């Protein structure tokens, strides 16, 4: 931070004993950090030397007794609620809260490491390694030593809380059916079937801010006005169900105008001897045809989902980059880590910044040739 | 197509089929490592298992497969790599292996399921490899996940 250099010497352990190495076996010297050529626009990096990328690397290592290369690298990091840990872009976890610190509101945060391995620097002024200039404003910098590398990040106070749940999907058509003492919800828009107990969840006593309630009522009215205003009737107030797998389903039961008439005329015959919510399942002769009609619709959607999911799941094993890109709606790198997929954002490059080499031949070995063209 | 698990094999231009036999999840045990002691350059590609058809029956050695299948061979082998990480499906969840060693078992609800065919609001990072040092010195091969068609 003070100058942009490293000591050209390092402590290492071999034979269960500490020993000090020296770059090219010389004396302690402040070596200059220079940018890496492969450094991306965002994930920047710096080194004291480049010996790894050049050919004859083995001979370069054997040309000296000891070699030491100081690395500095800027990476993305993510932490999710409760924020007890964070993960680096390298795939490595750090078992400390990114909000941890000696400040009054932070020493209560989670940490797995001893105080010896953590230091918080106040009044810290950054120095960009590409443009040797101090930052205009001070910050508090957290510093942590893992057994592999040291890691640093700017400390910030914990953000204010947000609503416990987010709207995942709006669904125009969702069939609910009672079976085996549980509800089962299904749709053509989502291939999963949600299972739930018959009891409605008492959301009103937990969503004290009406954050989920407001979003549900508004979305249902938007959809109803758009697609059902002239074809169906809403039976009653929205109902909330906690589905297996950890989802909250807000549901609004509907009746088609043509079906509502059967309840109306049946009610008139009963009165001669309106609240649809009281009548919905009381007339077996009206419901029996409906269970068979809608049951066939639900089964048809299941068959389509199994057919489509099978093709889609096989395609991603052949080319995950293409399948992930169309699923996410932007170019992403993807890789199958066994039976799950890892993903990352690809970085764009303007077409005029790319140059193509005139030949795919290899001079070093006459029998081989590149199978895809070289570029710069 | 049949609506039940079946084994199938292409005998040229027609398909031979047979019924797979089910095994309860508690009768299956996963081994702690994928290393092969007999030959240091190789490692199993899919984890080893040991199980029983019936709770009181004799124990049977095998190897895991795709979608909860159990193979009786122990023959899927790779040259051993560095930086290896894998999640294998294991009875309504996953087993996580790191550097050819068993680590822990996740519930299927622990991973974010991508929406059916189109999804948004997904968070991601500009993944930076941080390759192990041995890839330069000993020139050992870096793990690259399962093979794409390309």
């Amino acid at each position: 931070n003070a100058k942009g250099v490293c000591r050209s010497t390092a402590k290492y352990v071999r034979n269960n004993l500490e020993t000090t190495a020296f770059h090219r076996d010389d004396h302690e010297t402040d070596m200059e950090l220079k940018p890496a050529n492969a450094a991306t626009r965002t994930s920047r990096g710096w080194h004291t030397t480049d010996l790894k990328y050049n050919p004859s690397r083995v001979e370069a290592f054997h040309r000296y007794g000891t070699t030491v290369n100081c690395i500095v690298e800027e990476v993305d990091a993510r932490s999710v609620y409760p924020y007890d840990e964070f993960v680096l872009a390298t795939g490595d976890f750090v078992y400390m809260s990114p909000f941890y610190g000696y400040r009054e509101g932070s020493h209560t945060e989670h940490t797995s490491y001893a105080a010896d391995r953590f230091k918080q620097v106040d009044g810290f002024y950054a120095r960009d390694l590409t443009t040797k200039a101090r930052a205009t404003a001070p910050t508090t910098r957290n510093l942590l030593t893992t057994p592999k590398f040291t890691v640093a990040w700017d400390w910030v106070p914990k953000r204010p809380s947000v609503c416990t749940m987010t709207k995942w999907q709006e669904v125009d058509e969702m069939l609910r059916s009672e079976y085996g003492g549980s509800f089962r919800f299904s749709s053509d828009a989502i291939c999963t079937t949600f299972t739930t107990n018959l009891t409605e969840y008492p959301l009103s006593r937990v969503d004290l801010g009406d954050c989920i309630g407001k979003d549900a009522r508004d979305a249902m009215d938007r959809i109803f006005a758009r697609r059902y205003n002239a074809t169906h009737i809403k039976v009653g107030q929205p109902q909330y169900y906690l589905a297996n797998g950890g989802f909250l389903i807000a549901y609004q039961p509907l009746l088609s105008n043509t079906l509502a008439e059967l309840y109306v005329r049946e009610h008139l015959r009963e009165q001669s001897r309106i609240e649809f919510a009281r009548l919905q399942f009381t007339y077996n002769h009206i419901q029996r045809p409906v269970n068979d009609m809608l049951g066939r619709v639900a089964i048809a959607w299941c068959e389509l989902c199994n057919h489509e999911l099978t093709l889609w799941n096989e395609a991603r094993k052949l080319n995950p980059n293409a399948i992930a890109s169309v699923t996410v709606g932007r170019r992403v790198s993807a890789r199958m880590l066994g039976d799950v997929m890892a993903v990352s954002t690809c970085v764009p490059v303007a077409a005029d910044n790319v140059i193509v080499q005139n030949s795919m031949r290899i001079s070093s070995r006459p029998g081989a040739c590149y199978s895809r063209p070289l570029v710069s | 197509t049949v609506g039940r698990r079946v084994s199938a094999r292409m005998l040229g231009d027609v398909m031979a089929v047979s019924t797979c036999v089910p095994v309860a999840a508690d009768n299956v045990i996963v081994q702690n490592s994928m290393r092969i002691s007999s030959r240091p350059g190789a490692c199993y590609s899919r984890p080893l298992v040991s199980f029983r058809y019936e709770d009181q029956g004799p124990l049977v050695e095998g190897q895991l497969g795709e979608n909860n299948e159990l193979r009786l061979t122990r023959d899927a082998i790779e040259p051993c790599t560095v930086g290896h990480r894998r999640y294998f499906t294991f009875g309504g969840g996953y087993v996580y292996f790191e550097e050819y060693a068993y680590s822990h078992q996740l519930s299927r609800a622990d991973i974010t399921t991508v929406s059916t065919f189109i999804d948004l609001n997904i968070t991601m990072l500009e993944d930076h490899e941080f390759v192990p040092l041995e890839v330069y010195t000993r020139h050992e091969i870096k793990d690259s996940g399962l093979l794409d068609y390309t």
Partner: nanobody, 110 residues
Framework: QVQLVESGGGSVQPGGSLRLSCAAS??????????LGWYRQRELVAT???????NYADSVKGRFTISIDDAENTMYLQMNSLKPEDTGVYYC?????????WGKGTRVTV
């Protein structure tokens, strides 16, 4: 789901010693955990923050020693020369790459 079977808690006299332990179900291998350890009431007491790296609170250095057995899939916290200030509830915890688990806390008296 992983489950921790905590044991060894109790009561002693000043200058005494104890041995706490937490055995884990086969669904979580302790020797592969990112972090493991005990927390007083929360505040850290002793942990293993990497498969071969150990940590302790300043008042605990030299008194307690944490260890692990991969065969029995259990960790131990040997604690010696105990003082009245060491009394309280101790909670064992283990975590694997985002998955986290807490044991039911056990009391220790002096």
């Amino acid at each position: 789901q992983v489950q921790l079977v905590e044991s060894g808690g109790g009561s002693v006299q000043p200058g005494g010693s104890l041995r706490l332990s937490c055995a884990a179900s086969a669904s979580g291998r302790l020797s592969m955990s990112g972090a493991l350890g005990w927390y007083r009431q929360r505040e850290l007491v002793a942990t293993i923050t990497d498969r071969s790296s150990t940590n302790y609170a300043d008042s605990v250095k030299g008194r307690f020693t944490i260890s692990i057995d991969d065969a029995e899939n259990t960790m131990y916290l040997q604690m010696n020369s105990l003082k009245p200030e060491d009394t309280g509830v101790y909670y064992c915890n283990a975590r694997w790459r985002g998955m986290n688990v807490w044991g039911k806390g056990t009391r220790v008296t002096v």
